[PDB]
Design a protein around this ligand. Structure first.
Ligand SMILES: CC(C)CCOP(=O)(O)OP(=O)(O)O
Ligand SMILES: CC(C)CCOP(=O)(O)OP(=O)(O)O
Ligand SMILES: CC(C)CCOP(=O)(O)OP(=O)(O)O
Ligand SMILES: [Mg+2]
Lengths: 224, 223
């Protein structure tokens, strides 16, 4: 592990919680109860390593489920007094009104934090991020606030919910090799790391192993 | 393992050509020269398997950053499109910003598209001066133009409409194969790859063969 070659932004697809529980013969709720505690541990480790941002896929727009929407309220107690600045991205208006308030509370109470920035993607999809940006651009163009000529990569970077700097590394647990409608635009040149390890079993040595693998890779960005 | 039930659409990042050449103590041009013959070979195999679409990444919007000599060689070599695919039985389309390519390449592309448009087998989409950012931006511009001319409302902007404004269309790739060992999509079909299964192989593109293709397809199937 070389401290100089640390990625600044890690994206995380936190897959395998359901399978973890079912394979163990536990109630599926037991898998979900590991989600935020494990994410908090990963934030703690990452922050020590000098990682600046984590964007973590918690619930896609395509994803029982009454349980999940209630559990997602315990963001507050994990993070509110934690030193982590927390942002939530996704379709917030589709959520039960009380989860909406819990999310806002978590965001408001941590917005002053100067440590690691945790971005939780909850009812999020890449398609929907791109579409909301497109709509924002169209409304602006309709109101004479920009021209088609102004529609470029940087404009789009500013209208998307997940902002620059983009992820350097994406880690997906659970064994499947796909992005599953996570950060599509933002992943254009991200290094991908896939592991069979299920999210509840993913520890500090697994995280370190992913980062070491990242550091060995040559990033060329269309050049060299 | 292999069930005779196949992906409709494979996306292909044709990578590792320069390293292939330099491993053999050759000029990079020699690596590039295998690009289209290899692509044509992959189309033949895939067609026998019953694959309907291949989208192959030939030149990105970022590849302009390379040495002027290499970019010049590539832009010249790409004119061999017509000789390579005219009589191949493949229906060929190009996606990407055609208007910024040399005029001779543009007319060569148009001719290759025109001459193969009646082919009823495999559809080969070649991404040339293409990027995912580019695709999404041109789609967005088109939607903005239509909204400003009263041809649609902001409430009509949904996944289904966007699917139809993008250059790479439905069905989206079932499987992405990238040669050369690097584990990234490098600004290829970003929107279109949202649920695609990724297969990354260390095998360099000029060495890619029928066994490497069947291995990828097994992974897709095991899913
Ligand atoms: C758990 C998570 C949001 C990451 C994967 O979400 P998903 O299971 O819906 O994606 P897939 O169905 O494609 O595997
Ligand atoms: C194959 C292609 C036309 C573009 C993708 O390959 P690339 O070598 O430009 O991608 P990287 O620089 O990210 O390795
Ligand atoms: C087809 C193309 C121009 C890009 C893929 O080949 P490449 O030049 O990137 O080969 P290398 O990865 O070895 O540099
Ligand atoms: Mg390359």
């Amino acid at each position: 592990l070389d401290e100089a070659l640390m990625p600044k932004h890690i994206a995380l697809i936190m897959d395998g919680n359901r399978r973890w529980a079912k394979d163990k013969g536990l109630d599926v709720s037991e898998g979900y109860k590991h989600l935020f505690p494990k994410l908090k541990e990963i934030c703690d480790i990452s922050s020590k390593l000098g990682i600046q941002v984590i964007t973590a896929f918690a619930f896609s727009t395509e994803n029982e489920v009454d349980f999940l929407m209630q559990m997602f309220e315990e963001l507050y107690d994990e993070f509110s007094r934690s030193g982590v600045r927390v942002s939530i991205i996704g379709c917030k208006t589709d959520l039960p009104m009380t989860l909406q308030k819990c999310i806002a509370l978590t965001e408001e109470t941590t917005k002053g934090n100067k440590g690691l920035h945790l971005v939780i993607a909850l009812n999020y999809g890449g398609y929907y991020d791109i579409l909301q940006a497109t709509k924002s651009i169209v409304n602006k163009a309709m109101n004479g606030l920009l021209d088609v000529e102004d529609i470029n990569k940087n404009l789009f970077d500013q209208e998307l919910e997940s902002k620059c700097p983009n992820p350097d590394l994406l880690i997906r647990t659970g064994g499947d090799q796909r992005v599953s409608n996570f950060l599509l635009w933002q992943l254009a040149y991200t290094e991908f790391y896939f592991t069979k390890t299920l999210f509840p079993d993913f520890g500090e040595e697994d995280l370190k192993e992913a980062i070491i693998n990242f550091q060995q890779r040559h990033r060329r960005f269309g050049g060299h």
